[PDB]
Symmetry: D2
Subunit: 295 residues, 4 copies
Amino acid sequence: MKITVIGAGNVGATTAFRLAEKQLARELVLLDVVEGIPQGKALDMYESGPVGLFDTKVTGSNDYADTANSDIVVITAGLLLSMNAGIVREVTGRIMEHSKNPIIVVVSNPLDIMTHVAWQKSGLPKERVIGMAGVLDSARFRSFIAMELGVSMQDVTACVLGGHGDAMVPVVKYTTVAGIPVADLISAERIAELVERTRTGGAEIVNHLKQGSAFYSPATSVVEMVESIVLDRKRVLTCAVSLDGQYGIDGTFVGVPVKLGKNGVEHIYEIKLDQSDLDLLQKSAKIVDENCKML
Amino acid sequence: MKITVIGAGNVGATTAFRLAEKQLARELVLLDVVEGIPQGKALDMYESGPVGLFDTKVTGSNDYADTANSDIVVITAGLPRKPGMTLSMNAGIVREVTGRIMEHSKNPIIVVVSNPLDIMTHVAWQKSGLPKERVIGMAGVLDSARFRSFIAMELGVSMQDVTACVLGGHGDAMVPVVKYTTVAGIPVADLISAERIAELVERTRTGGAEIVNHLKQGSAFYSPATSVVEMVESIVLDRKRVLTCAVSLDGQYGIDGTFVGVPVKLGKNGVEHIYEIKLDQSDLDLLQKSAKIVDENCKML
Amino acid sequence: MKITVIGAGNVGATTAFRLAEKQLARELVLLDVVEGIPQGKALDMYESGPVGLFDTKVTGSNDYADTANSDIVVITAGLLLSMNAGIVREVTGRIMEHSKNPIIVVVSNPLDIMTHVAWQKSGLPKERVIGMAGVLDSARFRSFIAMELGVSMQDVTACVLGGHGDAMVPVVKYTTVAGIPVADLISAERIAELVERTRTGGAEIVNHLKQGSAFYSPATSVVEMVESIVLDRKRVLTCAVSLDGQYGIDGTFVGVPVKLGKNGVEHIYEIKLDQSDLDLLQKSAKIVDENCKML
Amino acid sequence: MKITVIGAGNVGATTAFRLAEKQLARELVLLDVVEGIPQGKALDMYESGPVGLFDTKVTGSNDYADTANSDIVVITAGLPRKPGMTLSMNAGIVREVTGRIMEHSKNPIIVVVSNPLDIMTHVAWQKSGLPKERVIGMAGVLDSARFRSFIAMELGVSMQDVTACVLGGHGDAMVPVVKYTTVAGIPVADLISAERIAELVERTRTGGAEIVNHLKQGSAFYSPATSVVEMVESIVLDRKRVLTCAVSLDGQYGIDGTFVGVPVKLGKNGVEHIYEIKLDQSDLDLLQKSAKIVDENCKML
Ligand SMILES: NC(=O)c1ccc[n+]([C@@H]2O[C@H](COP(=O)([O-])OP(=O)(O)OC[C@H]3O[C@@H](n4cnc5c(N)ncnc54)[C@H](O)[C@@H]3O)[C@@H](O)[C@H]2O)c1
Ligand SMILES: NC(=O)c1ccc[n+]([C@@H]2O[C@H](COP(=O)([O-])OP(=O)(O)OC[C@H]3O[C@@H](n4cnc5c(N)ncnc54)[C@H](O)[C@@H]3O)[C@@H](O)[C@H]2O)c1
Ligand SMILES: NC(=O)c1ccc[n+]([C@@H]2O[C@H](COP(=O)([O-])OP(=O)(O)OC[C@H]3O[C@@H](n4cnc5c(N)ncnc54)[C@H](O)[C@@H]3O)[C@@H](O)[C@H]2O)c1
Ligand SMILES: NC(=O)c1ccc[n+]([C@@H]2O[C@H](COP(=O)([O-])OP(=O)(O)OC[C@H]3O[C@@H](n4cnc5c(N)ncnc54)[C@H](O)[C@@H]3O)[C@@H](O)[C@H]2O)c1
């Protein structure tokens, strides 16, 4: 098992470190454009092995040749829509030169589009390319409900399809505390607020740090997904994937419940959404598929 | 944090070992009536510390003075069962044990595991003289675990993403709420036929017996030990987790005094909140019938 | 990764469970001769998955056909020397019918001989077959030193070659607390005692339980070894392996420091022992190689 | 168990996150001088709890009253360094911080991380007014970690099996004892040429600078955070671990009063024992020279 995390900033570095200590890979390559930074961070991570008790071979590089034969590739490269799309497209192209069949997990925003960009570029089947967002939105939502109710975050479940912001589709219907519907524990008034805080959760962090975005939750989320693939856990998580009919959408990437296994997306769940939500999901997908045209 | 586990059998020991490795306690005492067994299992466990990387001081004893001033006590003392069985004996055991520990620990949190659970928990609570918040029994978590593992098998999904609501107690007293059973929030009724769900609900119902018939000379202990610890960890780490445990109600679900398996918030103060969820008439009905049967025996004792 | 643990008694069951929760395998097969027991224990373990958060597919069986294509096989079968040798030889033969190239880790006593029996039977190269004992003896010794000094067991190191009992070769020279020689922390008087307690450590447990042997420490030890192989950790642990010259011994299995990787024994370390110890190791190996003749 | 971490930077935050996930504390406070950063990093961390499965209450603050009654305090406040550097400033920072926390916590265990370590630890201890057992600094563990990772690379063995003894402090004050450096007990001198060992001893010596030159805008934090936590975990779980930490000697190694990096037994009472190992004249010599230099500055302050 050889994993490559493109991008050595907070997100990709926090991600690689977690992936290193969890030992989900024998070889882990942290690659970035800036000289030095990737090499120093990967070394700092490696020298952590004797105390954290992991033996993952973590190396930082600038040469894609060091990412040859990677099984999984995490793309966190980013710095507009036309710019990043180019960054993502180029990166995908460079890795596809040294790896003929990996699973690509995208973490760049706009997620859905960036994921599409990468996919259509790699030439890999829609099963081998996915994006991360739902796990993260779900996580923020779950933590808000926890703070509200004074319960453990492990017992809170939150079904969140779609993308970030106005494109987010939180299914309050499939959201619970130990199976007990949130609707029976929290007023709709407050639930509406917690749903709002979730839509603008990334920004809430940014408004705090001023510089850059959030990276702990985002990194932890990406790993949960990678872990499922590596350990063939068959976990069901809301990821961005290319639909092929479900939800009355075809071709365009959307955030829907999926089963992640050694072969990536092993199943797309078409849950029962009510018109409202099902509409927002289709509009949002139209807007997205729109942009994927210019590109 | 000192944790005492009465009973060095399959459940008690497996539980103790798990507690040791997880390092939830600084001092872990494994006491039993039969001499030798707790000491040997305790040593075998401790000698595991260098490879499992934990330093919990696990001590096996036959003397209750060693349990003095405990924060949490796990009671697993009692005879299991053979293929063909289904309280007179354990009632006395559990009571003797409880009164025995209370001499050395005046304010612990007791977690009862001994069967018949609901009733054995009442016996301990009754004998301890501790407020009902400090005494609870383990059952729901295990029942839920089995239901989840089955659904996972059926759908081929991770057991982590399956949620199962199960209240009441074991056997016909088991009230599994398919309504609050899901796969990543998605209702199981939307993924598995009702006909097949009832069977899985059946397997769950007779889950313990399925293990007993296989083992033939005893019952299950791995899942039971894992479940007990999930509960203790919540208390130790004050995680405020919501788990189905056997506790003494005070009106919720239309039941008073008797111990029932309901969703509760578990913290360092024990039962910090009892959740009275929404159940249809048929479920409240069973839950209350069961509750009366249990309430029957308890008084008969 | 598919692992099979032969023997469903305390040792093999405690082992399989630990292997299940650590997720070192996708498929884990617990096989035994007695009907029912393996099926019940493996099920009890599996139903533990939702609370212990692992998804290892653990199944109990009586049909070796269910152990087909196993990568690693842990043999804990046992119930005299001629008896067990037959048990081990038969088991090895049955698995070799459904798996052409696994790594075999033996846990039956007498270890060295039982390991040889299995090896010469499987027909596999000496790299694919090893036995467990040193890790366990080291572990008991390490814990005694810890109890004596009032320090953590993680920081105690103990080099132990040879086998159990009189065949045990504890190198007090290579035994330390954070690198600090035990000889500088504990009197030779007491060290002699702690070394004695180690030689008879298995029996100390048995004298307590009356029925059967110890199984927690023995199981934890076996896993450490298996973990190293599965995760290609390249750990250095004293295991029983077929030497090929080192220590002035050839062919006969001995407990020596080795590097365990995805290919099993990747290196045998010939440390510098003083005559005394080096002698006890050769005598012990002669006695062993003696018995491996009758068989 | 309440743990305060002063400094929400790369080391402070990475450390806090690790502490949160490991659940070693119920309440974890991340305080900094710059407003916003600790709050944001704290939230980002907490929002990680549902996927990382931990419930530690991580709160980011700018107010010291939030650190009140802390059991353990980790000081990482201070300016790092850029390629080309090697105390005047941090001395004031560390002292201000220490006197600030002591107003709200009257008996914590302070773990200093701010450079120059040996000296910054003296500054805190001096200002806290706490017995020398309650104040220690982190350095040895990190130095040892780097040496181990190098040997592992060189021999192709697990880093878990490599043991490295390193005393003193960073730089020329670093006293790595090749004599007590091994691979599964086997002396490294028996596995690696002396010539190559000295180089690895060199890399270790300038390890931090190697990271600094790569990063260019800051220093290392992953290994440093991992090392600090290894120490805190020992205290929290009273594991009595033996780690090389910077502490105030009282004669051992022929050094009095000054802080030196020596092997110590770490428990809930802090430094529970200082180990005076056997060193040859040359090593005792450096250790003492370094110690005097450090003892020099401290008084100059
Ligand atoms: N999926 C989500 O919901 C989510 C959450 C958080 C952040 N993000 C996004 O993830 C990205 C990384 O966030 P961060 O906080 O780690 O940022 P960052 O700026 O610290 O790190 C990104 C790193 O990528 C490098 N980079 C840029 N272009 C590159 C290229 N072509 N090849 C290789 N490296 C390149 C930069 O130089 C930089 O060091 C951002 O685009 C951000 O918007 C997404
Ligand atoms: N709540 C559940 O879901 C659940 C699951 C499994 C087992 N159980 C119950 O837990 C109990 C233990 O199961 P087990 O498999 O560990 O059994 P076991 O027979 O292996 O062990 C029970 C131990 O209790 C000891 N014991 C008996 N009387 C005692 C007394 N007065 N004081 C101290 N120790 C005493 C025995 O000597 C024995 O070692 C049984 O009552 C069983 O039915 C409940
Ligand atoms: N390596 C060590 O240092 C070490 C430590 C402890 C125990 N051991 C040895 O390990 C073995 C297991 O110990 P245990 O405590 O688990 O014992 P146990 O008797 O509880 O379990 C062994 C199981 O193997 C089964 N068995 C016997 N022959 C078999 C065959 N041909 N095929 C399949 N299953 C068979 C039995 O029926 C039994 O259920 C013993 O031989 C013991 O002496 C070695
Ligand atoms: N002991 C070791 O082995 C070791 C390893 C790495 C770093 N360090 C040292 O640790 C310190 C922090 O390193 P870093 O990488 O986290 O740096 P950093 O610059 O990322 O973070 C330091 C944080 O301290 C805060 N700060 C400054 N003055 C403060 C005051 N008076 N009160 C409260 N907060 C204040 C800053 O605002 C900043 O967020 C440095 O002094 C560095 O040299 C020691």
